[PDB]
Amino acid sequence: LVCNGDSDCDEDSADEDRCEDSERRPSCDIDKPPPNIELTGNGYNELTG
Amino acid sequence: CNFSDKEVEDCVTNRPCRSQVRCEGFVCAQTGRCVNRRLLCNGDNDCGD
């Protein structure tokens, strides 16, 4: 996943540090995730809901 | 009231102090912000300057 064209480290992006764009290849046609997929990653509190 | 509820006097340097907090990173010369060397040549002003 290092030097790959995706930020596979999430908060850091150190895998994409110091990477030549001539060495990169297009990882995918697109980058756009589904419209609110981040909500699927939230925790949940069962009491408060 | 007078705004000067604060007042200040200068002194001699009676004693040293250890304020010289060690930065292992790069020191943003004008700001003194300590930034990680991976943020050099980042394409982004991660310094102030």
Curated annotation (Swiss-Prot), chain A:
Residues 21-32 have a biased composition (Basic and acidic residues). Disulfide bonds join C3-C19. It is found in: Secreted; Target cell membrane. C-, N- and O-glycosylated. O-glycosylated with core 1 or possibly core 8 glycans. Residues 8-20 have a biased composition (Acidic residues). Residues 8-43 are annotated as: Disordered. Coiled coil: none annotated. Component of the membrane attack complex (MAC), a multiprotein complex activated by the complement cascade, which inserts into a target cell membrane and forms a pore, leading to target cell membrane rupture and cell lysis. The MAC is initiated by proteolytic cleavage of C5 into complement C5b in response to the classical, alternative, lectin and GZMK complement pathways. The complement pathways consist in a cascade of proteins that leads to phagocytosis and breakdown of pathogens and signaling that strengthens the adaptive immune system. C7 serves as a membrane anchor. Monomer or dimer; as a C5b-7 complex it can also form multimeric rosettes. Component of the membrane attack complex (MAC), composed of complement C5b, C6, C7, C8A, C8B, C8G and multiple copies of the pore-forming subunit C9. It is linked to Complement component 7 deficiency: A rare defect of the complement classical pathway associated with susceptibility to severe recurrent infections, predominantly by Neisseria gonorrhoeae or Neisseria meningitidis. Belongs to the complement C6/C7/C8/C9 family. This is Complement component C7. It comes from Homo sapiens. The gene is C7. The chain holds residues 101 to 149 of 843 of the full protein.
Curated annotation (Swiss-Prot), chain B:
Disulfide bonds join C23-C34, C28-C47. Glycans are attached at N2. Ca(2+) binds at L39, N42, D44, D46. This is Complement component C8 beta chain. It comes from Homo sapiens (Human). It comes from the Eukaryota. It is found in: Secreted; Target cell membrane. Heterotrimer of 3 chains: alpha (C8A), beta (C8B) and gamma (C8G); the alpha and gamma chains are disulfide bonded. Component of the membrane attack complex (MAC), composed of complement C5b, C6, C7, C8A, C8B, C8G and multiple copies of the pore-forming subunit C9. N-glycosylated; contains one or two bound glycans. Not O-glycosylated. Belongs to the complement C6/C7/C8/C9 family. Component of the membrane attack complex (MAC), a multiprotein complex activated by the complement cascade, which inserts into a target cell membrane and forms a pore, leading to target cell membrane rupture and cell lysis. The MAC is initiated by proteolytic cleavage of C5 into complement C5b in response to the classical, alternative, lectin and GZMK complement pathways. The complement pathways consist in a cascade of proteins that leads to phagocytosis and breakdown of pathogens and signaling that strengthens the adaptive immune system. The lineage of its organism: Eukaryota, Metazoa, Chordata, Craniata, Vertebrata. Residues 21-49 form the LDL-receptor class A domain. It is linked to Complement component 8 deficiency, 2: A rare defect of the complement classical pathway associated with susceptibility to severe recurrent infections, predominantly by Neisseria gonorrhoeae or Neisseria meningitidis. The gene is C8B.
